[PDB]
Amino acid sequence: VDKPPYLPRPRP
Amino acid sequence: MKGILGVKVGMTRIFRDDRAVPVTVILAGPCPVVQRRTPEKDGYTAVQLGFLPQNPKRVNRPLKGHFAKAGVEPVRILREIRDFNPEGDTVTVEIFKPGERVDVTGTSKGRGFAGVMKRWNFAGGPDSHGAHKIHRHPGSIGNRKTPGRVYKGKKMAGHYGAERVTVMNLEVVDVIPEENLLLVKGAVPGPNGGLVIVRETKKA
Amino acid sequence: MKTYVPKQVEPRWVLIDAEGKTLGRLATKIATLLRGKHRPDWTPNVAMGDFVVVVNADKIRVTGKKLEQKIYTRYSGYPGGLKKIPLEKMLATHPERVLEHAVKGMLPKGPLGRRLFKRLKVYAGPDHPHQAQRPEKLEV
Amino acid sequence: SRIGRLPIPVPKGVSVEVAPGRVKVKGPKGELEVPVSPEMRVVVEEGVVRVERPSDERRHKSLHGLTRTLIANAVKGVSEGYSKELLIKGIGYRARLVGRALELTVGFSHPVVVEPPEGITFEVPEPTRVRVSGIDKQKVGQVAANIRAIRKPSAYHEKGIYYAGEPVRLKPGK
Amino acid sequence: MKVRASVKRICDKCKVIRRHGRVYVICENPKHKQRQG
RNA sequence: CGCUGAAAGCAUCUAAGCGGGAAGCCCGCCCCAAGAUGAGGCCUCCCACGGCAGCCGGUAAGGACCCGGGAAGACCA
RNA sequence: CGAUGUCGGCUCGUCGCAUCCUGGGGCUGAAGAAGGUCCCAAGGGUUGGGCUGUUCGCCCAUUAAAGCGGCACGCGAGCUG
RNA sequence: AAGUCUGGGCUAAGUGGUAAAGGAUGUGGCGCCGCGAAGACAGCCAGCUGGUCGAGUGGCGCCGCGCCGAAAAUGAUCGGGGCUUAAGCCCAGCGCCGAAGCUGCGGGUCUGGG
Ligand SMILES: [Mg+2]
Ligand SMILES: [Mg+2]
Ligand SMILES: [Mg+2]
Ligand SMILES: [Mg+2]
Ligand SMILES: [Mg+2]
Ligand SMILES: [Mg+2]
Ligand SMILES: [Mg+2]
Ligand SMILES: [Mg+2]
Ligand SMILES: [Mg+2]
Ligand SMILES: [Mg+2]
Ligand SMILES: [Mg+2]
Ligand SMILES: [Mg+2]
Ligand SMILES: [Mg+2]
Ligand SMILES: [Mg+2]
Ligand SMILES: [Mg+2]
Ligand SMILES: [Mg+2]
Ligand SMILES: [Mg+2]
Ligand SMILES: [Mg+2]
Ligand SMILES: [Mg+2]
Ligand SMILES: [Mg+2]
Ligand SMILES: [Mg+2]
Ligand SMILES: [Mg+2]
Ligand SMILES: [Mg+2]
Ligand SMILES: [Mg+2]
Ligand SMILES: [Mg+2]
Ligand SMILES: [Mg+2]
Ligand SMILES: [Mg+2]
Ligand SMILES: [Mg+2]
Ligand SMILES: [Mg+2]
Ligand SMILES: [Mg+2]
Ligand SMILES: [Mg+2]
Ligand SMILES: [Mg+2]
Ligand SMILES: [Mg+2]
Ligand SMILES: [Mg+2]
Ligand SMILES: [Mg+2]
Ligand SMILES: [Mg+2]
Ligand SMILES: [Mg+2]
Ligand SMILES: [Mg+2]
Ligand SMILES: [Mg+2]
Ligand SMILES: [Mg+2]
Ligand SMILES: [Mg+2]
Ligand SMILES: [Mg+2]
Ligand SMILES: [Mg+2]
Ligand SMILES: [Mg+2]
Ligand SMILES: [Mg+2]
Ligand SMILES: [Mg+2]
Ligand SMILES: [Mg+2]
Ligand SMILES: [Mg+2]
Ligand SMILES: [Mg+2]
Ligand SMILES: [Mg+2]
Ligand SMILES: [Mg+2]
Ligand SMILES: [Mg+2]
Ligand SMILES: [Mg+2]
Ligand SMILES: [Mg+2]
Ligand SMILES: [Mg+2]
Ligand SMILES: [Mg+2]
Ligand SMILES: [Mg+2]
Ligand SMILES: [Mg+2]
Ligand SMILES: [Mg+2]
Ligand SMILES: [Mg+2]
Ligand SMILES: [Mg+2]
Ligand SMILES: [Mg+2]
Ligand SMILES: [Mg+2]
Ligand SMILES: [Mg+2]
Ligand SMILES: [Mg+2]
Ligand SMILES: [Mg+2]
Ligand SMILES: [Mg+2]
Ligand SMILES: [Mg+2]
Ligand SMILES: [Mg+2]
Ligand SMILES: [Mg+2]
Ligand SMILES: [Mg+2]
Ligand SMILES: [Mg+2]
Ligand SMILES: [Mg+2]
Ligand SMILES: [Mg+2]
Ligand SMILES: [Mg+2]
Ligand SMILES: [Mg+2]
Ligand SMILES: [Mg+2]
Ligand SMILES: [Mg+2]
Ligand SMILES: [Mg+2]
Ligand SMILES: [Mg+2]
Ligand SMILES: [Mg+2]
Ligand SMILES: [Mg+2]
Ligand SMILES: [Mg+2]
Ligand SMILES: [Mg+2]
Ligand SMILES: [Mg+2]
Ligand SMILES: [Mg+2]
Ligand SMILES: [Mg+2]
Ligand SMILES: [Mg+2]
Ligand SMILES: [Mg+2]
Ligand SMILES: [Mg+2]
Ligand SMILES: [Mg+2]
Ligand SMILES: [Mg+2]
Ligand SMILES: [Mg+2]
Ligand SMILES: [Mg+2]
Ligand SMILES: [Mg+2]
Ligand SMILES: [Mg+2]
Ligand SMILES: [Mg+2]
Ligand SMILES: [Mg+2]
Ligand SMILES: [Mg+2]
Ligand SMILES: [Mg+2]
Ligand SMILES: [Mg+2]
Ligand SMILES: [Mg+2]
Ligand SMILES: [Mg+2]
Ligand SMILES: [Mg+2]
Ligand SMILES: [Mg+2]
Ligand SMILES: [Mg+2]
Ligand SMILES: [Mg+2]
Ligand SMILES: [Mg+2]
Ligand SMILES: [Mg+2]
Ligand SMILES: [Mg+2]
Ligand SMILES: [Mg+2]
Ligand SMILES: [Mg+2]
Ligand SMILES: [Mg+2]
Ligand SMILES: [Mg+2]
Ligand SMILES: [Mg+2]
Ligand SMILES: [Mg+2]
Ligand SMILES: [Mg+2]
Ligand SMILES: [Mg+2]
Ligand SMILES: [Mg+2]
Ligand SMILES: [Mg+2]
Ligand SMILES: [Mg+2]
Ligand SMILES: [Mg+2]
Ligand SMILES: [Mg+2]
Ligand SMILES: [Mg+2]
Ligand SMILES: [Mg+2]
Ligand SMILES: [Mg+2]
Ligand SMILES: [Mg+2]
Ligand SMILES: [Mg+2]
Ligand SMILES: [Mg+2]
Ligand SMILES: [Mg+2]
Ligand SMILES: [Mg+2]
Ligand SMILES: [Mg+2]
Ligand SMILES: [Zn+2]
């Protein structure tokens, strides 16, 4: 279940 | 089977054996038979009933013809009852006595474009805790790449009501033949003034 | 010289008693008649085969346990909408559908194939309404 | 070692008419038709019916014995007729006739009423013995079975509806 | 009824019957009843 | 779970045949539905117009436009 | 890798059946009632709360029951964060 | 597109058209023993021998083809229809269909020889 994210969130 | 055409007039309660019983009053009689469907001729059995008198100044020639072959004053509404073949050429509320159970058909009230909450009793969204412009929205409507589409029949916003509804097994509480009235216990679809059909019930 | 191509001709009407015949093996022949491949001037891109009338389609015959075990299927587009109907029941309710489905599957797919299927007239019971066209009895 | 080729004694006077795929057996107690494989040949000899098969392969041997007994049972049917007896063990448990019909009182909250089908006759001697009798052997066996089912033999007590000449095997309770 | 891949005679009164495409073992002792599956 | 019953003289619910047996399956209830192009059916109405399976002109039975509205409705219907 | 947004919750379901309940069964070391165990069955049903981000799990009070899985560990151009 | 082609056999599961240990009076074919007209096996009458019954009967193994074992998620299906002395499987044939392979005819270009 809890696995590390492979993408970050965002920006501009 | 037996049935009659009628208009829903309104609701009340009466008292019976020290009980209040909610009733809908239906003006059912009187309904002239204006055609019979026969198996030799039509492939099935039924009676075309007429209901409510019409200004002949409004009835066109093809319709006038139809009435005439049956020798019937022009009537506003024409509707069939299936597998019903009355001895007489006029059907009145007297085909029902109190205690009988009936099925009533009407046109439900129309809510026009109905949201998913009113229509299908969806839960909608939260009203605080971050909810973003989704308070009455339906949520997910599917999965992902498998199946990658939305099912036929998915409950969704859209028009609601103004549709044929039949509620079943209503007690006939009284009948007042001198005034063509039927008293049915409980609730009947549609607005006051709406056309309804009262048939003998199919429940046992 | 270029290959002969026929001008339009009068189509032949034709009668077949399905009684006691084996579903698939009859189906095969009806399709041929339908495509018109029995005709030396056969042309693949026009309808020039026969009209085929079949009677006694309820008395089609079938080998093995296909009465109980052959399943006809229909998908409605809705969730859970796959209906399954056994041969036995199809015969008990719409017996001409049995032979109709069979022939239809052995006709080409596409606009022409669909026209050809319309030229198939199948009937349960021994009578048919096309005495007007006076179809020619076929032994198949 | 064989049933089909053993010949069928026919009492005087029952008649046996042969047709393709059936034989009809009339007698003092009525008629009965026996559907029979077209592969088998039934033979009407003096005072006797025989059945013959056309090969010695599996299906044919199997049909052979079957058909001989099938017809033997029909013969005995219209002559002597058939019957089965039911014993009714259990304290509250009793039976009686109501017209043609059978009324079982076997410990339910109600009594059960069995209607005799066509060709079947109910008889109650004691109120604890029932006789199902008819000319059709498999029909008599059926109805009898039917009656017994209304209250099968308990496993623990000598109680319920029994076949006459049915053993009373029981198992202990605590 | 016991339902197993290996249906076998359990006592000398056991009998291996075959009905309706399935191998059964019927017997006087109700415990020995078997259906293959 | 049976009845009758061979192969296999016995036995066997099975190989011929026949029973019983689920909230499940088919029908039954409610709703949609002939674009069901396989386009169904019945009742009634008009009618056989003028000019060179096509074109043009005026009508029939009917329909639409417009308007007063409507527990019908986003417009449309 | 010139981007296939990643746990959990919410919302909305839909499917499988190795069936949690309800229906039908066989055996029981099945007296009755109540259980065990296997078979048939996917129609419907499958509660509210305390703790933790939790999935899970423990616990409280109930229940016929408080099923287990798939759908990109279903669902962020639906929401949360 | 071309055989509902011919002849012999097997399979009854739609096996063919999705799998294993293992299980089984499925079916066909082989083979080997045991018992039996000095009366066997099965039933009906006893105590492993008697009595009528008058034929076979019981066990072991091998081969072909089938049966079970066989539960997973959107709607099914051997590609489909449909197929059962086959339109399935094994053995043996004759014929046809079938590619831009081969041939016929015509042409181009390069290379080699005239
Ligand atoms: Mg009718
Ligand atoms: Mg009718
Ligand atoms: Mg009808
Ligand atoms: Mg009627
Ligand atoms: Mg609103
Ligand atoms: Mg609302
Ligand atoms: Mg609502
Ligand atoms: Mg609510
Ligand atoms: Mg809510
Ligand atoms: Mg809310
Ligand atoms: Mg909420
Ligand atoms: Mg925000
Ligand atoms: Mg807000
Ligand atoms: Mg898709
Ligand atoms: Mg829809
Ligand atoms: Mg909707
Ligand atoms: Mg509407
Ligand atoms: Mg209705
Ligand atoms: Mg009530
Ligand atoms: Mg009630
Ligand atoms: Mg009163
Ligand atoms: Mg109406
Ligand atoms: Mg055939
Ligand atoms: Mg044929
Ligand atoms: Mg031909
Ligand atoms: Mg046949
Ligand atoms: Mg069959
Ligand atoms: Mg779907
Ligand atoms: Mg459905
Ligand atoms: Mg499914
Ligand atoms: Mg469906
Ligand atoms: Mg047919
Ligand atoms: Mg013989
Ligand atoms: Mg017996
Ligand atoms: Mg019995
Ligand atoms: Mg029974
Ligand atoms: Mg008995
Ligand atoms: Mg004890
Ligand atoms: Mg076991
Ligand atoms: Mg088991
Ligand atoms: Mg074992
Ligand atoms: Mg042993
Ligand atoms: Mg069965
Ligand atoms: Mg036994
Ligand atoms: Mg028996
Ligand atoms: Mg016997
Ligand atoms: Mg016998
Ligand atoms: Mg059978
Ligand atoms: Mg068989
Ligand atoms: Mg049955
Ligand atoms: Mg219920
Ligand atoms: Mg309608
Ligand atoms: Mg239409
Ligand atoms: Mg319609
Ligand atoms: Mg269509
Ligand atoms: Mg048409
Ligand atoms: Mg029409
Ligand atoms: Mg019609
Ligand atoms: Mg009319
Ligand atoms: Mg005119
Ligand atoms: Mg004129
Ligand atoms: Mg003109
Ligand atoms: Mg002119
Ligand atoms: Mg006008
Ligand atoms: Mg409105
Ligand atoms: Mg308006
Ligand atoms: Mg407008
Ligand atoms: Mg990448
Ligand atoms: Mg991008
Ligand atoms: Mg992108
Ligand atoms: Mg929550
Ligand atoms: Mg939430
Ligand atoms: Mg919430
Ligand atoms: Mg799903
Ligand atoms: Mg679910
Ligand atoms: Mg599945
Ligand atoms: Mg399924
Ligand atoms: Mg299961
Ligand atoms: Mg399991
Ligand atoms: Mg388990
Ligand atoms: Mg249960
Ligand atoms: Mg239960
Ligand atoms: Mg149980
Ligand atoms: Mg106990
Ligand atoms: Mg108990
Ligand atoms: Mg106890
Ligand atoms: Mg176990
Ligand atoms: Mg149990
Ligand atoms: Mg368990
Ligand atoms: Mg279920
Ligand atoms: Mg589920
Ligand atoms: Mg909760
Ligand atoms: Mg909770
Ligand atoms: Mg707190
Ligand atoms: Mg919590
Ligand atoms: Mg907390
Ligand atoms: Mg938690
Ligand atoms: Mg934890
Ligand atoms: Mg309980
Ligand atoms: Mg909980
Ligand atoms: Mg789940
Ligand atoms: Mg789920
Ligand atoms: Mg995963
Ligand atoms: Mg999950
Ligand atoms: Mg996810
Ligand atoms: Mg996603
Ligand atoms: Mg987001
Ligand atoms: Mg998220
Ligand atoms: Mg997304
Ligand atoms: Mg997206
Ligand atoms: Mg949303
Ligand atoms: Mg944070
Ligand atoms: Mg051939
Ligand atoms: Mg099978
Ligand atoms: Mg298959
Ligand atoms: Mg298979
Ligand atoms: Mg291995
Ligand atoms: Mg193997
Ligand atoms: Mg063995
Ligand atoms: Mg063998
Ligand atoms: Mg073998
Ligand atoms: Mg002996
Ligand atoms: Mg001795
Ligand atoms: Mg299988
Ligand atoms: Mg299953
Ligand atoms: Mg192919
Ligand atoms: Mg051959
Ligand atoms: Mg070529
Ligand atoms: Mg070349
Ligand atoms: Mg050349
Ligand atoms: Mg070169
Ligand atoms: Mg040179
Ligand atoms: Zn045993």
Q: Do C76 and B152 touch (CB under 8 A)?
A: yes
Going through chain C in order, the beta strands assigned E by DSSP cover: 13-17, 51-55, 71-75, 82-86, 120-122, 136-137
C81 touches strand G (CB under 7 A): no
* Ligand found nearest the CA of B117: 6
User: Residue D70 carries which side chain, given as an amino acid letter?
Assistant: L
8 Å CB contact between D8 and D50: yes
What does D123-157 look like in DSSP terms, one character per residue?
Answer: E-SSTTEEEEEES-HHHHHHHHHHHHHTTPPPSSS
E4 CB burial (10 A radius; 0-12, 13-18, 19+): exposed
Query: How far apart are alpha carbons D83 and C31 in whole angstroms?
Result: 59
Question: CA B65, C1' F48: Å apart?
Answer: 21
Three-class DSSP category at B35: strand
Which residue is the nearest neighbor of H69, CA to C1'?
E5
E2 C-beta neighbours (distance < 10 Å), count? 13
Closest residue by Cα to residue C52 from C108, C95, C97, C100: C100
Closest residue by Cα to residue B32 from B56, B59, B54: B54
CA distance B154 to chain C (A): 9
Would you give the distance in Å from CA B150 to the centre of its chain? 33
8 Å CB contact between B115 and B121: no
The DSSP element (H or E) to which D51 belongs, if any, is: strand D48-52
Three-class DSSP category at D68: helix
* Residues of C with Cβ-Cβ distance to B153 under 8 angstroms: 78-79
C42 C-beta neighbours (distance < 10 Å), count? 13
Backbone angles phi, psi at B190, to 5 degrees: 90, 175
Query: How far apart are alpha carbons B60 and D10 in whole angstroms?
Result: 85
8 Å CB contact between D37 and D63: yes
Would you give the distance in Å from CA B162 to the centre of its chain? 10
Strand partners, B4: B198
**Residue C6 Cα distances to C9, C41, C44, angstroms:** 8, 7, 11
Nucleotides of H under 7 A from a protein CB: 1, 4, 12-14, 20-28, 40-41, 55-57, 67-70, 74-76, 80-85, 87
Question: CA B37, C1' F61: Å apart?
Answer: 26
Strand B20-27 and strand B3-15: the pairing is: antiparallel
Nucleotides of G under 7 A from a protein CB: 3, 5-8, 10-16, 25-32, 38-40, 43, 53-55, 71-76, 78-81
- Is any Cβ of chain B less than 8 angstroms from the Cβ of C76? yes
Query: How far apart are alpha carbons C2 and B105 in whole angstroms?
Result: 71
Query: How far apart are alpha carbons E13 and B197 in whole angstroms?
Result: 71
Query: How far apart are alpha carbons B91 and D152 in whole angstroms?
Result: 57
- Is any Cβ of chain B less than 8 angstroms from the Cβ of C78? yes
Query: How far apart are alpha carbons D20 and D38 in whole angstroms?
Result: 6
* Ligand found nearest the CA of D174: 38
Nucleotides of F under 7 A from a protein CB: 1-19, 26, 29-32, 38, 41-46, 61-63, 71-74
* DSSP one-letter code for B177: G
8 Å CB contact between B164 and B105: yes
Sign of CA dihedral D102, D105, D111, D112: negative
**Residue C14 Cα distances to C40, C45, C52, C75, D11, angstroms:** 18, 22, 5, 34, 59
Q: Which residues contact B62 (CB under 8 A, 6 or more apart)?
A: none
C-alpha of residue D79 to centroid of ligand 76, in Å: 57
CA distance B148 to chain C (A): 14
Sign of CA dihedral B79, B85, B89, B95: negative
Query: How far apart are alpha carbons C57 and C60 in whole angstroms?
Result: 5
Would you give the distance in Å from CA D37 to the centre of its chain? 22
Query: How far apart are alpha carbons D2 and B30 in whole angstroms?
Result: 82
Asked how this structure was determined, the answer is X-ray
What does A1-12 look like in DSSP terms, one character per residue?
Answer: -----SS-----
CA torsion, ordered C94, C96, C97, C100, to nearest 10 deg: -170
* Ligand found nearest the CA of C81: 31
Query: How far apart are alpha carbons D120 and D140 in whole angstroms?
Result: 7
Query: How far apart are alpha carbons D128 and D108 in whole angstroms?
Result: 16
8 Å CB contact between D14 and D26: yes
Q: Which residues contact B64 (CB under 8 A, 6 or more apart)?
A: B56, B74
Question: CA C104, C1' F35: Å apart?
Answer: 21
B96 C-beta neighbours (distance < 10 Å), count? 22
